[PDB]
Design a protein around this ligand. Structure first.
Ligand SMILES: Cc1cc(N2CCCCCC2)n2ncc(-c3ccc(F)cc3)c2n1
Ligand SMILES: Cc1cc(N2CCCCCC2)n2ncc(-c3ccc(F)cc3)c2n1
Lengths: 236, 236
């Protein structure tokens, strides 16, 4: 068992990445509509964002909407696409006071313009902050990301701006959506699924993984600290 | 609890991939030199190869030697590099009778020529078999593999043989060392480590993962069947 000051004892991952799964199953379990659970999960986002920022986490990356989530019922998809506005309308000033930097990774051209408009004002309103980086992964997939790196590098070779022999691992990393950000030392996934689901495939080559049966809406600060306690046990 | 005929009831992954970790810790636990454990692990390879082939697994991919394993003591590295000869000198005729196809993925130019010579005769001696494919991952790393796909695609674009707009996900897959092989539906990792260690990063986008505390030399047929039982519980 762990509590907080025992966690500050040790290493705090500079970059944590979380697959926020299990919202539907949390609402189903309470005899609630699935959209209720998405809404509950929205609170745990900022509650987790605040705790990680006190601890000194420097990048928090949260998988909000997968490329494969487009296939869900249209009423749900449209509600999920309204959650960023609702989240920012509720928490953005708090995030400004907390020195947070809001950022987005994924293919944005596929979001409704009312969802994009709201996000981009968040990014600008927190641009000149230098605190913790809050990365929402929205319409994000690892294979797409890797292919678009290859296509970009290929296009520069085609134009003569890049020699093939200068393409190495580190150069490849800079054409990923994660840009120059450091790779996540710790990946957390809730809801009892033990898989990666096409999330950040390159970037978690060496990450530690922590899977929990806890559903995302139930993922309060002690579960989060316990996940950090696991991380500190991992060697080599 | 599961046994075999309960496993044939259900789906058998066409392609299983295993990270064979924990040989050193198994020898340490028995007050044995670490090279003893590598040697023990060599038996469990063919014992696992036989069981998977009866079950109808079509591709077995086993992570034998990682790119980062070069940094181990030189006496151990040289012994690990002698294991393929020893393994084939002991089991290759059995693998020929069993209709197996032996294949290798990784950067081979870095292996000693006595190790490469032995492997390549195995590959040729099983080339015209059409049974199960036994893939040893030897000097293999996912990031390197992805970069070399990008460099190959880039080189064809440079030469005019490939238009950039024809690079998509499926085309990208064909320039990976796994060629046209199907992705693994099931990934198994022994020794209690919960990470991917730069193994097959693209190819396990959607794979199910099963982690076990059992060390590889202790990974007998029931542990293997129990891992298959887990796999059959996984949905969506
Ligand atoms: C689609 C979606 C779903 C979403 N959920 C909240 C719980 C996670 C699981 C899905 C439901 N959340 N939570 C926050 C955002 C968000 C996105 C962009 C941004 F700039 C600020 C916040 C979000 N976006
Ligand atoms: C380096 C190494 C280590 C190795 N171990 C046996 C147990 C796995 C963990 C490392 C020790 N095994 N086991 C079989 C091979 C092999 C490689 C190529 C081939 F064509 C046929 C067999 C092997 N190669």
């Amino acid at each position: 068992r762990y509590t907080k000051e025992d966690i500050l004892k040790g290493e705090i991952p500079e970059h944590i990445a979380i697959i926020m799964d299990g919202n539907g199953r949390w609402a189903k379990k309470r005899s609630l509509p699935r959209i209720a659970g998405h809404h509950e999960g929205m609170k745990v986002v900022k509650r987790t964002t605040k705790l990680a920022n006190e601890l000194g986490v420097k990048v928090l990356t949260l998988y909000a909407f997968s490329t494969e989530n487009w296939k869900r019922p249209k009423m749900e998809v449209d509600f999920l696409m309204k959650l960023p506005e609702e989240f920012l309308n509720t928490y953005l000033p708090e995030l400004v006071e907390e020195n947070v930097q809001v950022r987005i990774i994924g293919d944005e051209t596929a979001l409704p313009a009312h969802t994009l408009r709201a996000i981009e004002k968040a990014v600008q309103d927190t641009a000149q902050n230098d605190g913790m980086i809050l990365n929402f992964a929205l319409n994000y997939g690892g294979r797409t990301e890797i292919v678009s790196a290859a296509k970009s590098l290929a296009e520069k070779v085609k134009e003569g701006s890049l020699n093939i022999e200068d393409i190495d691992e580190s150069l490849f990393s800079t054409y990923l959506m994660t840009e120059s950000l450091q790779d996540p030392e710790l990946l957390i996934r809730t809801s009892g699924e033990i898989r990666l689901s096409n999330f950040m495939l390159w970037q978690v080559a060496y990450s530690e993984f922590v899977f929990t049966d806890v559903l995302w809406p139930d993922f309060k600060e002690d579960h989060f600290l316990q996940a950090l306690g696991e991380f500190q046990q991992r060697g080599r």
